[PDB]
Amino acid sequence: DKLIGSCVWGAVNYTSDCNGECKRRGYKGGHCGSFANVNCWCET
């Protein structure tokens, strides 16, 4: 898995489409996965 952005919803790096972005990086899937949604992890 790999980090491609945050998940705080306010910082200058939130990924609304974590997977869309992940795919855009050649990955296969990604989404939030922490406490109170703070980081977006990919499944590289």
Side-chain angles (χ1 to χ4, degrees):
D1 54 291
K2 192 156 48 166
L3 194 78
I4 64 112
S6 173
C7 186
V8 170
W9 219 108
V12 68
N13 226 122
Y14 179 80
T15 38
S16 191
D17 188 353
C18 202
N19 184 176
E21 190 46 61
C22 253
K23 273 291 293 168
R24 224 163 276 264
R25 334 217 128 260
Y27 301 173
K28 54 262 249 68
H31 30 254
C32 197
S34 300
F35 195 69
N37 321 290
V38 288
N39 282 312
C40 225
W41 311 93
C42 207
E43 300 186 325
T44 49

